[PDB]
Amino acid sequence: EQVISLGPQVAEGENVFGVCHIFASFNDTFVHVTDLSGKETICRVTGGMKVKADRDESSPYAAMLAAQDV
RNA sequence: GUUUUCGGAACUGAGGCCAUGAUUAAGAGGGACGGCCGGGGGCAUUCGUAUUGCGCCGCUAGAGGUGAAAUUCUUGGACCGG
Ligand SMILES: [Mg+2]
Numbered sequence: 001e002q003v004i005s006l007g008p009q010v011a012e013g014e015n016v017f018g019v020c021h022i023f024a025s026f027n028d029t030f031v032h033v034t035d036l037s038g039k040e041t042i043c044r045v046t047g048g049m050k051v052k053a054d055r056d057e058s059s060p061y062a063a064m065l066a067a068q069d070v
Numbered sequence: 071g072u073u074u075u076c077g078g079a080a081c082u083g084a085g086g087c088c089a090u091g092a093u094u095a096a097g098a099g100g101g102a103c104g105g106c107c108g109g110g111g112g113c114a115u116u117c118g119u120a121u122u123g124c125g126c127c128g129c130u131a132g133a134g135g136u137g138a139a140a141u142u143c144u145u146g147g148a149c150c151g152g
Contacts, residue, residue: 021151027135032150034128039152041129046149048132055138 018042020070028057031067045069 010016019038023030029047034040047062048054050069056062 019151023150028133028149030150032129034151037152039128041151044130044150046132049130055136057133 024058024063026058029063029066031063031070033070043070 008016017036019034019036021030021032021034021038023032030044031046032044033042035042045066046057047059047066048057050065051057051059051062
């Protein structure tokens with residue numbers, strides 16, 4: 001703060017809410033995050049976009065690295 | 071001449087009497103009816119998410135699959151979310 005124009009006009013006490021569609025199946029992990037509606041997504045990261053081993057895509061190691069980028 | 075009811079055999083109508091004549095109701099069966107009961111059967115009827123595909127929309131570089139990988143789908147926006 002300021003950003004500036006990105007993000008809505010907010011106060012100190014209150015906060016803006018989003019939704020994280022965490023599709024953590026086997027063989028991969030998705031930490032998709034969107035607006036409160038669900039359709040205007042903000043940041044989409046998956047486990048495979050970080051690990052290059054093609055087998056750890058659902059491993060816990062890939063899982064939190066993707067989430068922190070979100 | 072025979073009369074032969076005569077001997078017996080023939081059919082038919084009105085009677086009495088017979089305690090007048092039907093064992094039982096199977097921890098057999100069949101039925102009947104009463105209140106139910108049951109993912110029993112058939113015909114229609116309605117609902118549910120899911121899957122697949124589609125049309126938009128935002129979004130981005132991988133997605134899928136495997137013990138690992140690959141065939142495969144991917145800037146024609148794949149996968150994801152509405
Ligand atoms: Mg693949």
